Design a protein around this motif. Structure first.
Motif, PDB file in Angstrom:
ATOM      1  N   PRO A 259       0.862  -1.173   0.000  1.00  9.95           N
ATOM      2  CA  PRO A 259       0.000   0.000   0.000  1.00  9.95           C
ATOM      3  C   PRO A 259       0.903   1.229   0.000  1.00  9.95           C
ATOM      4  O   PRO A 259       1.938   1.300   0.656  1.00  9.95           O
ATOM      5  CB  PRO A 259      -0.891  -0.127   1.194  1.00  9.95           C
ATOM      6  CG  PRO A 259      -0.513  -1.371   1.916  1.00  9.95           C
ATOM      7  CD  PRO A 259       0.534  -2.087   1.107  1.00  9.95           C
ATOM      8  N   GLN A 260       0.412   2.145  -0.788  1.00 10.27           N
ATOM      9  CA  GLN A 260       1.056   3.439  -1.007  1.00 10.27           C
ATOM     10  C   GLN A 260       0.387   4.504  -0.158  1.00 10.27           C
ATOM     11  O   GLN A 260       0.994   5.539   0.156  1.00 10.27           O
ATOM     12  CB  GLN A 260       1.044   3.796  -2.520  1.00 10.27           C
ATOM     13  CG  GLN A 260       2.219   3.041  -3.211  1.00 10.27           C
ATOM     14  CD  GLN A 260       3.391   3.048  -2.214  1.00 10.27           C
ATOM     15  OE1 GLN A 260       3.693   4.157  -1.705  1.00 10.27           O
ATOM     16  NE2 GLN A 260       4.021   1.907  -1.912  1.00 10.27           N
ATOM     17  N   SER A 261      -0.849   4.184   0.199  1.00  9.87           N
ATOM     18  CA  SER A 261      -1.680   5.074   0.998  1.00  9.87           C
ATOM     19  C   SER A 261      -2.355   4.435   2.178  1.00  9.87           C
ATOM     20  O   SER A 261      -2.632   3.225   2.122  1.00  9.87           O
ATOM     21  CB  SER A 261      -2.720   5.598  -0.004  1.00  9.87           C
ATOM     22  OG  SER A 261      -3.448   6.620   0.661  1.00  9.87           O
ATOM     23  N   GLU A 262      -2.637   5.212   3.240  1.00 10.17           N
ATOM     24  CA  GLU A 262      -3.309   4.485   4.375  1.00 10.17           C
ATOM     25  C   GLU A 262      -4.740   4.247   3.948  1.00 10.17           C
ATOM     26  O   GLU A 262      -5.250   5.036   3.112  1.00 10.17           O
ATOM     27  CB  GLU A 262      -3.192   5.194   5.709  1.00 10.17           C
ATOM     28  CG  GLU A 262      -1.801   5.595   6.209  1.00 10.17           C
ATOM     29  CD  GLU A 262      -1.560   6.007   7.632  1.00 10.17           C
ATOM     30  OE1 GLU A 262      -2.463   6.456   8.338  1.00 10.17           O
ATOM     31  OE2 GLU A 262      -0.354   5.849   8.022  1.00 10.17           O
ATOM     32  N   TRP A 509       5.912  -4.479  21.483  1.00  9.93           N
ATOM     33  CA  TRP A 509       5.881  -3.026  21.600  1.00  9.93           C
ATOM     34  C   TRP A 509       4.582  -2.551  22.241  1.00  9.93           C
ATOM     35  O   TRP A 509       4.546  -1.610  23.042  1.00  9.93           O
ATOM     36  CB  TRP A 509       6.094  -2.475  20.198  1.00  9.93           C
ATOM     37  CG  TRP A 509       5.843  -1.008  20.168  1.00  9.93           C
ATOM     38  CD1 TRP A 509       4.667  -0.354  20.151  1.00  9.93           C
ATOM     39  CD2 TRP A 509       6.889  -0.018  20.159  1.00  9.93           C
ATOM     40  NE1 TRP A 509       4.880   1.009  20.128  1.00  9.93           N
ATOM     41  CE2 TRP A 509       6.248   1.238  20.141  1.00  9.93           C
ATOM     42  CE3 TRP A 509       8.283  -0.092  20.169  1.00  9.93           C
ATOM     43  CZ2 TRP A 509       6.968   2.430  20.117  1.00  9.93           C
ATOM     44  CZ3 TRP A 509       8.991   1.096  20.152  1.00  9.93           C
ATOM     45  CH2 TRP A 509       8.343   2.333  20.121  1.00  9.93           C
TER      46      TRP A 509
ATOM     47  N   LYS B 351       1.008  11.377  15.111  1.00  8.73           N
ATOM     48  CA  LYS B 351       1.011  10.314  14.074  1.00  8.73           C
ATOM     49  C   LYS B 351       1.944  10.773  12.939  1.00  8.73           C
ATOM     50  O   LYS B 351       1.897  11.857  12.314  1.00  8.73           O
ATOM     51  CB  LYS B 351      -0.328   9.994  13.538  1.00  8.73           C
ATOM     52  CG  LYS B 351      -0.211   9.272  12.179  1.00  8.73           C
ATOM     53  CD  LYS B 351      -0.559   7.844  12.555  1.00  8.73           C
ATOM     54  CE  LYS B 351      -1.355   7.145  11.485  1.00  8.73           C
ATOM     55  NZ  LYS B 351      -2.588   7.874  11.109  1.00  8.73           N
ATOM     56  N   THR B 353       2.560   9.535   9.941  1.00  3.63           N
ATOM     57  CA  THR B 353       2.086   9.746   8.570  1.00  3.63           C
ATOM     58  C   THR B 353       1.150  10.916   8.470  1.00  3.63           C
ATOM     59  O   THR B 353       0.681  11.247   7.341  1.00  3.63           O
ATOM     60  CB  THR B 353       1.479   8.389   8.034  1.00  3.63           C
ATOM     61  OG1 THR B 353       0.473   7.882   8.945  1.00  3.63           O
ATOM     62  CG2 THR B 353       2.583   7.349   7.824  1.00  3.63           C
ATOM     63  N   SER B 528       0.876   1.451  10.685  1.00  2.00           N
ATOM     64  CA  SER B 528      -0.128   1.596   9.613  1.00  2.00           C
ATOM     65  C   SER B 528       0.404   0.868   8.379  1.00  2.00           C
ATOM     66  O   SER B 528       1.569   0.449   8.405  1.00  2.00           O
ATOM     67  CB  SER B 528      -0.478   3.014   9.268  1.00  2.00           C
ATOM     68  OG  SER B 528       0.371   3.722   8.415  1.00  2.00           O
ATOM     69  N   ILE B 530       1.209   2.084   5.841  1.00  2.00           N
ATOM     70  CA  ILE B 530       2.146   3.126   5.349  1.00  2.00           C
ATOM     71  C   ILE B 530       3.358   3.154   6.200  1.00  2.00           C
ATOM     72  O   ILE B 530       4.459   3.683   5.919  1.00  2.00           O
ATOM     73  CB  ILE B 530       1.202   4.406   5.271  1.00  2.00           C
ATOM     74  CG1 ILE B 530       0.576   4.124   3.834  1.00  2.00           C
ATOM     75  CG2 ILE B 530       1.603   5.843   5.262  1.00  2.00           C
ATOM     76  CD1 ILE B 530       1.610   3.175   3.117  1.00  2.00           C
ATOM     77  N   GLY B 531       3.169   2.529   7.367  1.00  2.00           N
ATOM     78  CA  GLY B 531       4.240   2.471   8.379  1.00  2.00           C
ATOM     79  C   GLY B 531       3.990   3.696   9.274  1.00  2.00           C
ATOM     80  O   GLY B 531       4.939   4.108   9.976  1.00  2.00           O
ATOM     81  N   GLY B 532       2.792   4.266   9.262  1.00  2.00           N
ATOM     82  CA  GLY B 532       2.587   5.455  10.152  1.00  2.00           C
ATOM     83  C   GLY B 532       2.699   4.966  11.602  1.00  2.00           C
ATOM     84  O   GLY B 532       2.230   3.832  11.869  1.00  2.00           O
ATOM     85  N   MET B 533       3.272   5.717  12.515  1.00  2.00           N
ATOM     86  CA  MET B 533       3.362   5.305  13.936  1.00  2.00           C
ATOM     87  C   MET B 533       2.847   6.518  14.763  1.00  2.00           C
ATOM     88  O   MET B 533       2.886   7.680  14.330  1.00  2.00           O
ATOM     89  CB  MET B 533       4.675   4.934  14.575  1.00  2.00           C
ATOM     90  CG  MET B 533       5.174   3.621  14.097  1.00  2.00           C
ATOM     91  SD  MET B 533       4.430   2.251  15.033  1.00  2.00           S
ATOM     92  CE  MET B 533       5.370   2.382  16.559  1.00  2.00           C
ATOM     93  N   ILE B 535       2.148   7.570  19.288  1.00  2.00           N
ATOM     94  CA  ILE B 535       2.457   7.027  20.625  1.00  2.00           C
ATOM     95  C   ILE B 535       1.479   7.768  21.538  1.00  2.00           C
ATOM     96  O   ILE B 535       1.806   8.857  22.004  1.00  2.00           O
ATOM     97  CB  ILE B 535       3.894   7.157  21.168  1.00  2.00           C
ATOM     98  CG1 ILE B 535       4.963   6.427  20.334  1.00  2.00           C
ATOM     99  CG2 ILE B 535       4.053   6.630  22.654  1.00  2.00           C
ATOM    100  CD1 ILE B 535       6.237   6.199  21.194  1.00  2.00           C
TER     101      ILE B 535
END
Lengths: 548, 548, 50
Positions: A259-262, A509, B351, B353, B528, B530-533, B535
């Motif tokens: 995926p390129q987008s969330e 985590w 976040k 992303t 995500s 997208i790799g969004g993180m 905390i």
């Protein structure tokens, strides 16, 4: 002596942290036990025949015919979680330990009292309670485990769960061999299926008496009794659940597109034709490698026949299963087989102040995903031509034996040399703690009723009884019934269970699932203005563990 | 050396259980720090004057005028919870420990790299990155704590919170004395209130340089640097909250009548006339003994002026409070004073992303009930005639100074010799861990920004800087600006924080409040597509403790 | 507030002693930790110092 206490009350559970994250939990439990003289002073051999009920075709599962020996003794049973820990303690164990070891057990009887009810049949007929100072309580500890093992928890007949509420023991009884035949039928089964109670195979007969087998102790007020310490032999109990299915074992497929987008629809994609992928399968005649198809090392869980009654020498019985289902599909509504159900009273969880005699109950849905959705199952002809053709598939939907409410999953069994399963999790507070192994050549891999089975040695059962308080008139050769002075006894029971636990360590985590009080359950942990109490059940293997 | 690593990455936090329920937590944190050459190679003395904004009557609180020294050095700050623990670890601490002890701190710089950007101003203007093998990184550890203390967490300028995301240090700057005068006013205040920046008291002047005060280390690739171990001096931090108010201290009144039936309206009743009860009060002229009236031993919490700006030598400043409110009455809506608010970026919780430059924020509502509902307050004339008469009462409702939006609670202060309060709870992950005490004769009883204040000794700050990479042309007597080769450095930072904790023990029948993942927060602890993180912040003194 | 809830029972927390006529019980000696109490009053006001 007469004016001297012979014991101490103790219902404190101690947690003593050792080295290298090992705790030593020692649970103290104390109760006031109330006990009455026996109905009779005899052993009785009784049969239960509800033939009338099974007499209705389609009601076989309602069978209760059995023979049993009724004894003048009572059983003191304390093997249920609720006897040793409270909601508070359970939270501690369950949220912070990762494995449990049952180490030992000890129990003792003290501060014995015997009184005799004297009725001054007056206008308003009165009754005076007096102390019988020279009377005796009879105690018998079957430490060689001679008597047949009868865990009172399968009947919700253990000591009660609250330290400030007096309790009572259960009348001890045990099964006596019988022979019975019952042929299944259904609503509108012409005729009357054989339903016969044949009687007893003489070679299967074993009449046991306490008196002839265990040494009996008479305790008077001044006396006391103490079992010594018994050490159990048992594999540890895990406090974590597994969640991985055959479908989640090992290396996932490498995704050639990410995926390129969330976005809940922004999936990644394997980039390769299912019939052009590399990898291993056990489908020698196919080139399709899919997640349902790719090879896994063994199988987690198994399929077993459901609502299967089997029959042997004494009537039909339900086939047991090691784990039920629940989750994505089963809740109370997605009701299935394998999940245990607990029924109980005021002494073990039913709200104290509640009026009414319906038991309190609950169906336990564990957390380890090791069961099955039979509805998702399918058998399919070996040619494997794919959009499979109605006659190369057997769906949980097609009927077997022409019954429309039966499908191959109800008779299905996929247990085999690659089956991997876990023992049963603890059920707080109504569940049994330990169980006696079967004295069978080959033994069961688990017991569905206790996480702890002691093999070579278990603590013996404890039997109690008011000794006979005869009156002036007593004729042993009369065919009548012995007349006794109405006597009863109150004594204090103190037990001590020691566990060994290990502390959990975070490895992810993300946080874990923990037991916690909240605005919706809060009132289940405190008394009512009436002093009503209740003890809601809880789950135990809340945190996850990786299977592979 | 050149081809030799000088260090190891380690972001593992170890929990090592000792004897008698003491754990020794050792938090390892490792990051890749990216650093650029300085804007300038000079110390700059700059003033910030937003007079224009305060120029609007009624906007005094918008004041930002200050003087500061801008330095060519960067600060490496790792004092924020999020640098050392993840959501996973925090759950462990917070759900199972009862007190925290900060023991020591160590940090080291390794695997230093310096590159120089060379631009081949081509069609599509290009740039080549090359290694400058003989270049040096400059490291300075102010261990005698000479420089003024500047905790980067009050600006959300600490190292970042994720071990797999490179980070950067902050440009070091410190306050320089100035004199400013600002007279408050309001919307429609005729005229223009004095708003003057007077300048600097010469006797308050202190210009500090790193070069003149700390020994500077030049590290080349082959080099490495390590601070040694610093031990802190600090009282322990409690991981439990208190809930008892003056209203819940000691022996409750004996109820002469108890509910006979269960029911949310079936109250019990003291049975005695409020003016006919026994007990103690501090109302010498009254016979009324009520729960609001009866004597308590001291006072839990205190009242302080709210939205109070005070002014000294350098402008107005908000008066700080030790605890805010929230609960029965305050949520986000029942918004009050005393509760801290945190604003931050992608490196510390916002976040990852998310596009957009609005900080991520949150208002922290602790769990210890030690604050106030000013709305429930009332002053009342000493005669104490009861249905009090409008002019023998001062209600949070009557106006002071004739202002209708001001009442006596805003100027009120009930702090005194009977005040009992608790230090501030930890704010994960944005909160600061430790703070330097004030070098003041009399010190503050607490710090509202860190649970740990080190008195006698704190670890010194760590300063870093790319040394000057001059070009062939360099003339020290030119009034111009030194021309440098565009250099930047990447180095690995490894820190080690050790704590000592004690394990909690259950003491109530009922379970405790624990942190747990659930279907609503679950996705806040995993990446995500997208790799969004992100905390999300958490609370820390979840379990209760009895105050008295 | 559910997080402020603490139900305590004697039975679960303290060891209980059953005493019959013949029995007796004794706490042992507890030592306190406390600053002394003055048995004198002061009378000087800011107005009477020095």
């Amino acid at each position: 002596g007469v004016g001297i206490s012979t014991g101490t009350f103790n219902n404190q559970t101690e947690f003593k942290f050792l080295e290298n994250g090992w705790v030593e939990i020692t649970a103290n439990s104390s109760r006031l036990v109330h006990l009455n003289m026996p109905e009779s002073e005899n052993y009785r051999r009784v049969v239960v025949n509800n033939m009338d009920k099974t007499a209705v075709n389609g009601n076989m599962a309602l069978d209760d015919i059995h023979a049993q020996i009724v004894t003048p003794w009572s059983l003191v049973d304390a093997n249920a979680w609720g006897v040793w820990f409270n909601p508070g303690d359970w939270q501690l164990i369950v949220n912070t330990m990762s494995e449990l070891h049952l180490v030992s057990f000890e129990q003792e009887i003290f501060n014995v009292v015997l009184k005799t009810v004297s009725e001054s049949a007056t206008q308003p007929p009165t009754k005076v309670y007096n102390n019988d100072l020279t009377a005796s309580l009879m105690v018998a500890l079957d430490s060689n485990n001679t008597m047949p093992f009868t865990p009172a928890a399968m009947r919700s007949e253990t000591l009660g769960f609250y330290p400030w509420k007096p309790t009572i023991p259960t009348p001890w009884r045990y099964y006596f061999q019988w022979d019975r035949t019952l042929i299944p039928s259904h609503t509108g089964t012409s005729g009357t299926p054989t339903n016969i109670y044949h009687g007893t195979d003489p070679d299967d007969v074993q009449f046991y008496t306490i008196e002839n087998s265990v040494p009996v102790h008479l305790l008077r007020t001044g006396d006391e009794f103490a079992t010594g310490t018994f050490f159990f032999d048992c594999k540890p109990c895990r406090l974590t659940h597994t969640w991985q299915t055959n479908r989640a074992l090992g290396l996932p497929p490498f995704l050639n597109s990410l995926p390129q987008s969330e976005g809940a629809t922004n999936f990644g994609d394997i980039g390769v034709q299912q019939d052009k992928r590399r990898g291993v399968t056990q489908m020698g005649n196919t080139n399709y490698i899919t997640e349902a198809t790719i090879m896994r090392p063994a199988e987690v869980g198994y399929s077993a026949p459901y609502y299967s009654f089997e029959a042997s020498t004494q009537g039909p019985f339900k086939t047991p299963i090691a784990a039920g289902r629940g989750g994505a599909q089963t809740d109370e509504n997605q009701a299935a087989d394998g999940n245990p159900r607990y029924a109980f009273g005021r002494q073990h969880g039913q709200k104290t102040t509640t009026t009414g005699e319906t038991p309190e109950r609950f169906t336990y849905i564990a957390h380890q995903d090791t069961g099955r959705y039979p509805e998702g199952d399918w058998i399919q002809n070996i040619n494997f031509n794919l959009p499979v053709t109605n006659d190369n598939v057997l769906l949980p939907t097609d009927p077997i034996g022409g019954k429309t409410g039966i499908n191959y999953t109800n008779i299905f069994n996929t247990y085999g040399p690659l089956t991997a399963l876990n023992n049963v999790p603890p059920v707080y507070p109504n569940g049994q703690i330990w169980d006696k192994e079967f004295d069978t050549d080959l033994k069961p891999r688990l017991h569905v009723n206790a996480p702890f089975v002691c093999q070579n040695n278990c603590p013996g059962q404890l039997f109690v009884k008011v000794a006979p308080n005869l009156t002036n008139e007593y004729d042993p050769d009369a065919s009548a019934n012995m007349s006794r002075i109405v006597t009863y006894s109150d004594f204090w029971w103190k037990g001590k269970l020691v566990f060994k636990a290990k502390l959990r360590a975070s490895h992810t985590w993300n946080p874990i699932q923990q037991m916690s009080i909240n605005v919706d359950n809060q009132f289940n942990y405190v008394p009512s203005n009436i002093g009503g109490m209740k003890i809601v059940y809880e789950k135990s293997q809340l945190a996850p563990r990786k299977l592979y």
